[PDB]
Amino acid sequence: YEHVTVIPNTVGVPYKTLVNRPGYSPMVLEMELLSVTLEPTLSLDYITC
Amino acid sequence: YEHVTVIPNTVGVPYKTLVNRPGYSPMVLEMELLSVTLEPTLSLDYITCEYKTVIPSPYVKCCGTAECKDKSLPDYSCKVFTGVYPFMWGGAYCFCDTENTQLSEAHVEKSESCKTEFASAYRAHTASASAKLRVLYQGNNVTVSAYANGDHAVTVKDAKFIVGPMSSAWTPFDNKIVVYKGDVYNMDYPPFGAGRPGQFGDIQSRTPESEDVYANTQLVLQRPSAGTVHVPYSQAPSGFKYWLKERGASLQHTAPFGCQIATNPVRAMNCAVGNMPISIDIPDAAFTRVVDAPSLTDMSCEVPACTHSSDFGGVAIIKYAASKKGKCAVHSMTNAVTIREAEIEVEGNSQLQISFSTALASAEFRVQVCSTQVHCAAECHPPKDHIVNYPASHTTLGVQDISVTAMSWVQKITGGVGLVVAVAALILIVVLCVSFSRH
Ligand SMILES: CCCCCCCC/C=C/CCCCCCCC(=O)OC[C@H](COP(=O)(O)OCC[N+](C)(C)C)OC(=O)CCCCCCC/C=C/CCCCCCCC
């Protein structure tokens, strides 16, 4: 059962989301962003020494 | 005690029936059709096969002219060609350069493959239905097989079953059918002895072992090439071989109602048309006195969750208080809702769970445990899967006005419009009364 949810991008703060499906008992998932990384693609221009 | 009921002819879908004999605890029987077979009566018109052209070695008459003979062979042809100068390997065959004739002659016959490779052209009169049924009786599955003509009652476990007759005479075979070996086709083959050349039926025979053969292949003899001792001819190619390539799709792949076709004998299996009248006779020893049966009071029913998903997508929980321990019949008194369970064990003060299938988006129905019924209702969600590999267990949604609760919107709008119309009519009639009093 695909369940799309949105949590704020804050790191280290747990967020509880409710996964509810008819015929099945509701499920709650506790999730917590441990780390988020942004990796720029670099195109070196020149080296200075 | 004898009971009669009618079930839809759909194969593989169980149905529940209620046997409410007065003075006894009601009994619920479940019957499911395992297979339904139609086997038409066949009369063999003729057979077709590949022909062979029998050519005797030509008679080349040296220094003279031969004469055409005559006989009654299937497609006998004879022609005398004059002016031939045939050559064999060692030199000319005829002494003189001319005044020679060749007596070419040929006929046709059944091949030797007609014992194995043939197509039978039948005439299907009428079907003799026969059904094999599985009935859940006394909490036991017992398989009952019998003819479906409404007669030929069969007895198992002291019960007497009579099944049929078919509610519909529909059959997937026309009057004229042909069977190759496993396939059957609905085709209108030519009359025996009137078959066209180069088409199915160019050579016919009453039986594969018969000797008399009709063959119309327009065999025409042709003039032999100069200096050759052959017998050329022009003939329409075998129509049976042409048919084999251009057969098309058999009845097994084109029949409606999801029919299945077999052979030896030819049958039509699982025709999903009509309904099956079935009558059951049960011994009095099977029933129980209503007093001796457990009695149930203080029944409450709730639906924790439900879904109209064609596969018992709903569950109902029923609380109850029982007089004594014993089996009890569960029956849904609403065609729109089908309940899987048939009988249940009941004891003390406890609760029991049942599963039901429905098409209503809002379920409202009365479940009748033995001798006592309870109202039940809840909302049904729609399922997520679009397609499934099995038929719907429940019946159709409903032939009439089974729209869901939250039709309260319809009630509200209709009531408001009716109130406005009633107010307008009242104003009209009061002013009419006032104006009619005035004079
Ligand atoms: C001044 C103007 C006058 C002009 C007159 C207008 C005439 C127009 C009409 C002609 C009628 C058209 C019918 C077409 C033929 C269909 C036949 C059919 O094949 O019939 C399908 C079935 C009916 O079965 P039957 O009874 O005939 O079979 C029993 C048969 N016998 C009775 C013989 C035993 O139909 C079903 O079952 C399907 C069930 C599906 C139910 C759909 C529910 C739709 C509900 C919508 C509600 C909207 C939400 C409200 C929200 C409002 C908020 C404000």
TrEMBL record, chain B:
Keyword Glycoprotein annotated: yes
Protein's GO biological process: entry receptor-mediated virion attachment to host cell; fusion of virus membrane with host endosome membrane; monoatomic ion transmembrane transport; proteolysis; symbiont entry into host cell
Single GO MF descriptor: serine-type endopeptidase activity
Domain of life where this protein originates: Viruses
Record has RNA-binding as a keyword: yes
Function recorded in the entry: Provides the signal sequence for the translocation of the precursor of protein E3/E2 to the host endoplasmic reticulum. Furin-cleaved E3 remains associated with spike glycoprotein E1 and mediates pH protection of the latter during the transport via the secretory pathway. After virion release from the host cell, the assembly protein E3 is gradually released in the extracellular space. Acts as a viroporin that participates in virus glycoprotein processing and transport to the plasma membrane, cell permeabilization and budding of viral particles. Disrupts the calcium homeostasis of the cell, probably at the endoplasmic reticulum level. This leads to cytoplasmic calcium elevation. Because of its lipophilic properties, the 6K protein is postulated to influence the selection of lipids that interact with the transmembrane domains of the glycoproteins, which, in turn, affects the deformability of the bilayer required for the extreme curvature that occurs as budding proceeds.
Transmembrane intervals: 417-437
Section of the entire sequence shown: 810 to 1248 of 1248
Compartmental location: Host Golgi apparatus, Host trans-Golgi network; Host cell membrane; Host cytoplasm; Host endoplasmic reticulum
Record protein name field: Structural polyprotein
Primary location group: host cell
Organism per entry: Chikungunya virus (CHIKV)
Keyword line: Capsid protein, Cleavage on pair of basic residues, Disulfide bond, Fusion of virus membrane with host endosomal membrane, Fusion of virus membrane with host membrane, Glycoprotein, Host cell membrane, Host cytoplasm, Host endoplasmic reticulum, Host Golgi apparatus, Host membrane, Host nucleus, Host-virus interaction, Hydrolase, Ion channel, Ion transport, Lipoprotein, Membrane, Palmitate, Protease, RNA-binding, Serine protease, T=4 icosahedral capsid protein, Transmembrane, Transmembrane helix, Transport, Viral attachment to host cell, Viral attachment to host entry receptor, Viral ion channel, Viral penetration into host cytoplasm, Virion, Virus entry into host cell
GO cellular component, one term: host cell nucleus
Assembly mode: Homodimer. Homomultimer. Interacts with host karyopherin KPNA4; this interaction allows the nuclear import of the viral capsid protein. Interacts with spike glycoprotein E2. Interacts with host IRAK1; the interaction leads to inhibition of IRAK1-dependent signaling.
Disulfide bridge map: C49-C114, C62-C94, C63-C96, C259-C271, C306-C380, C328-C370
